[PDB]
Amino acid sequence: MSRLVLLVNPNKVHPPIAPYALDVLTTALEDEGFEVEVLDLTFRRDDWKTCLHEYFAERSPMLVGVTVRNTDTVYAFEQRPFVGEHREIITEIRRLTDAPVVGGGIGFSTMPFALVEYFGIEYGVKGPGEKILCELATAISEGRDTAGIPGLIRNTERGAVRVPPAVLTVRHGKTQPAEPTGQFEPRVWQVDQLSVYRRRSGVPRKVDNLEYYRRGGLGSILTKNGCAYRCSHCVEPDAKGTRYGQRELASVVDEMESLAAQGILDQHTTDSEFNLSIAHAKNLLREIVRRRHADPDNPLNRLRLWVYCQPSPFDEEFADLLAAAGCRGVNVGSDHIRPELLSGWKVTEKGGTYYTFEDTERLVRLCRERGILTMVEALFGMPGETPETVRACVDAFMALDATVTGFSLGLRLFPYTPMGIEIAEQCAGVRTAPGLQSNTADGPIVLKPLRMCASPAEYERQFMFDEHGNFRLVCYFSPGLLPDPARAADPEERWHGAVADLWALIDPADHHRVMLPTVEGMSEHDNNYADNPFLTSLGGLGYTGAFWSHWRGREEIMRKAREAAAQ
Numbered sequence: 001m002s003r004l005v006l007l008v009n010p011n012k013v014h015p016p017i018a019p020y021a022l023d024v025l026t027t028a029l030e031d032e033g034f035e036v037e038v039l040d041l042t043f044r045r046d047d048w049k050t051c052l053h054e055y056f057a058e059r060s061p062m063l064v065g066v067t068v069r070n071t072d073t074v075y076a077f078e079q080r081p082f083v084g085e086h087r088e089i090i091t092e093i094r095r096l097t098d099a100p101v102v103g104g105g106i107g108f109s110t111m112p113f114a115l116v117e118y119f120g121i122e123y124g125v126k127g128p129g130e131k132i133l134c135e136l137a138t139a140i141s142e143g144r145d146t147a148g149i150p151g152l153i154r155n156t157e158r159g160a161v162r163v164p165p166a167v168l169t170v171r172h173g174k175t176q177p178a179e180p181t182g183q184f185e186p187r188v189w190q191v192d193q194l195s196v197y198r199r200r201s202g203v204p205r206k207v208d209n210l211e212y213y214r215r216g217g218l219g220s221i222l223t224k225n226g227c228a229y230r231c232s233h234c235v236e237p238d239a240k241g242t243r244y245g246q247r248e249l250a251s252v253v254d255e256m257e258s259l260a261a262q263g264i265l266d267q268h269t270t271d272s273e274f275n276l277s278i279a280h281a282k283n284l285l286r287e288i289v290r291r292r293h294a295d296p297d298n299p300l301n302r303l304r305l306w307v308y309c310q311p312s313p314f315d316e317e318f319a320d321l322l323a324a325a326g327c328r329g330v331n332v333g334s335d336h337i338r339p340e341l342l343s344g345w346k347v348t349e350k351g352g353t354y355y356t357f358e359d360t361e362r363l364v365r366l367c368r369e370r371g372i373l374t375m376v377e378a379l380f381g382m383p384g385e386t387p388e389t390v391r392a393c394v395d396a397f398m399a400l401d402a403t404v405t406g407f408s409l410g411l412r413l414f415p416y417t418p419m420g421i422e423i424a425e426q427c428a429g430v431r432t433a434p435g436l437q438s439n440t441a442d443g444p445i446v447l448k449p450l451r452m453c454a455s456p457a458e459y460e461r462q463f464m465f466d467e468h469g470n471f472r473l474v475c476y477f478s479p480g481l482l483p484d485p486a487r488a489a490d491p492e493e494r495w496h497g498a499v500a501d502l503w504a505l506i507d508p509a510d511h512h513r514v515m516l517p518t519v520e521g522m523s524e525h526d527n528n529y530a531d532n533p534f535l536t537s538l539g540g541l542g543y544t545g546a547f548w549s550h551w552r553g554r555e556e557i558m559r560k561a562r563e564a565a566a567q
């Protein structure tokens with residue numbers, strides 16, 4: 001038999017982000033006695049087939065895992081998929097080996113049945129994969145059937161079918177049977193809450209964390225899996241899990257310390273929301289502070305922590321703990337200010353809102369008082385949006401004086417989001433719904449609710465593909481933001497006008513401190529044709545931290561990079 005597992009990173013996006021998933025999976029598999037090799041194609045974009053050809057001629061893994069982090073850019077005006085490029089890589093893999101292929105990933109978990117069938121692979125995993133993957137590797141290595149592996153999606157001849165999880169929720173003392181889609185499960189049992197995830201650098205066939213760090217990819221640290229809220233736009237409760245799988249505090253800080261020891265000082269939390277499940281977050285910060293104080297030589301004394309938060313809970317004690325631990329920046333998904341828009345959108349599982357604008361105001365103030373940078377995010381175009389609701393949000397958000405204020409437009413729809421479900425209900429398989437849009441749509445988009453679909457794959461694929469299999473990435477954009485539908489226009493032309501309308505709301509004296517969506521022709525639009533001079537300047541001068549922490553001074557940083565190159 002063989003105990004060799006290959007893990008492939010097909011992510012070709014630059015600036016590059018380390019495939020943290022593979023470090024989690026490597027640790028679990030190695031701890032269970034398997035040999036793991038990683039083939040990272042991110043730094044082999046221009047010759048990834050050569051990389052594959054070399055590997056499979058020399059090595060014969062008995063299982064091949066592929067991490068699919070992003071399905072598309074998720075920019076509603078762009079609709080640029082990655083799954084076609086992912087399939088090309090998987091198709092080449094299957095030409096080189098008969099070993100089974102298993103897929104996983106956060107993006108993968110938003111539509112895992114559709115992707116198992118689209119990629120033509122044997123197995124898929126929805127949610128955290130470290131435990132399921134070990135059971136799968138054990139079954140394959142021992143030549144066993146995989147029909148008893150809880151949670152495993154298996155591609156049968158009639159489509160993808162999931163083995164039920166063994167851990168079921170309980171209501172009224174009776175277990176609740178699993179959904180054939182596996183949707184909106186807690187998935188805590190899937191999480192390795194104990195181990196320190198080994199983060200290596202310079203090791204062949206392992207994720208090279210320092211390489212990503214030197215190319216701008218901040219250290220990543222997971223503290224807890226899942227999200228217990230149910231925001232209507234958000235894939236993460238379903239795709240990650242609806243309850244918190246909290247990691248052991250000592251293991252998280254051990255991992256952060258290991259990163260810092262290698263010089264990976266800027267670390268970004270990879271929780272869904274760092275300040276939800278707040279007691280764990282505060283206990284984590286307390287432990288970081290305790291280690292920093294206990295030993296001046298502990299490399300955590302140079303930690304630069306970057307976190308992502310919701311507006312609440314964010315109190316004075318939390319801000320003091322962030323400051324003491326080394327937090328340099330907080331990114332907050334405030335998203336809007338109007339209650340008529342936030343109602344039914346930014347909600348708990350019970351359906352109620354959980355913050356007010358005062359919570360964002362307090363967050364920004366507390367961070368300002370402590371020298372912590374802030375990025376406040378807004379999303380425009382959700383149901384209810386009109387030009388006056390956008391202006392009201394712009395005016396209120398801009399007055400915060402956040403370090404950076406980021407604005408997004410439109411929503412890419414996914415099958416296991418309240419928005420996607422509700423919009424599919426409105427279609428009921430017989431009509432289109434207001435606000436539904438796709439740049440490649442040939443006529444009205446008629447979605448089907450899950451109960452009207454023959455399979456999970458059918459329900460999932462319709463949000464990305466049309467009936468003929470062509471890419472047709474589905475979006476929502478408030479009809480309150482579009483001109484009268486009687487004036488004909490190209491789909492991308494309407495998006496262009498909507499983006500231009502938003503730009504017109506920003507005072508030019510504030511452009512230095514805002515991030516706006518752009519399309520071709522607009523100021524500072526970034527394309528795949530030419531390099532970003534700001535990104536190259538940050539690297540050349542050795543700037544550290546989150547990209548947005550240097551946005552205000554981007555012109556100066558480019559000037560100084562020109563100066564340093566000449567000197």
Ligand code: B12
Nearest residue numbers: 013017021065067070071104105106107128129218220270
């Ligand atoms: C932090 C973060 C970022 C940071 C990354 C910082 C850094 N240095 O790491 C920044 C801001 C840079 C970022 C950028 C982007 N992000 Co982001 N990001 C996240 C976030 C919150 C955490 C990602 C993470 O590291 N998670 C922790 C790791 C361990 O989890 P994981 O990858 O899911 O891995 C587990 C499972 O998926 C599974 N699994 C994974 N791979 C495999 C493989 C196999 C074989 C198996 C069996 C299982 C398996 O097991 C793993 C271990 O438990 C996620 C949401 C989330 N909660 O995951 C969004 C998210 C992944 N990002 C998203 C997007 C859209 C992007 C961008 C494309 C945005 C853009 N247009 O530029 C870029 C892409 C960057 C790139 N190069 O790939 C979307 C993806 C949606 C989709 N449908 O694809 C998400 C879901 C946010 C959202 N709610 O929309 N992001």
Ligand code: SF4
Nearest residue numbers: 227229231234236272
């Ligand atoms: S946006 Fe809402 S549902 Fe999504 S991760 Fe944040 S709190 Fe959870």
